[PDB]
Amino acid sequence: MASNAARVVATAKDFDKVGLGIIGYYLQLYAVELILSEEDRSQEMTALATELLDTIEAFKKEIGGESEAEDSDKSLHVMNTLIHDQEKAKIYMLNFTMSLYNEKLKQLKDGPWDVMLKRSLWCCIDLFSCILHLWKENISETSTNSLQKRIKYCKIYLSKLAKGEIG
């Protein structure tokens, strides 16, 4: 529960190291609401959510276009659509999560299985939960069930991989 918020925050930092701040940007927002949606909060968790708000505003301000648009209001403006338009970002976030998730199942077809894959599967599971939480209103309950099945598939196969059943 609360540990999931830490993984999401640390996972978001991983994308920044790769230069994909847009992906980490949505992950930080998911963990922020995650702490607020948590009935149990500690001074450390409550303060952690506040620090994330500063990053979200700093990240959005980086592409808000209030002044950056003057430098480039053409390509940056469209990029802002990714951050400002939640519906359009939802598709890209789903495509990114589905692209990573699709690769794991493709590897399941015949790709090599190893502990490294075990950690990657856990990372994909976090991305799916963020997509549902970030836009529950834009996702129907039936559509959400389809996403949960993909996460469940990893949960079942992830266990088989750790049991040495796959390989």
């Binding site: 495509n95 699709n102 079942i156 266990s159």
Partner: protein
Amino acid sequence: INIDKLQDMQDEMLDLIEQGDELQEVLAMNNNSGELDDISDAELDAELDALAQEDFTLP
């Protein structure tokens, strides 16, 4: 405009979902009737929660 090109290539974000269509083909070859009910999801789910602690950090 270069929104798709900036993040990836000329391909459209929806095209990335087409790749997801291939995922169905992958699971389909493994077993079209491949359903969680056919896989011991109940026993595997409990064992994974213990394994999750192995790769995760507990306070």
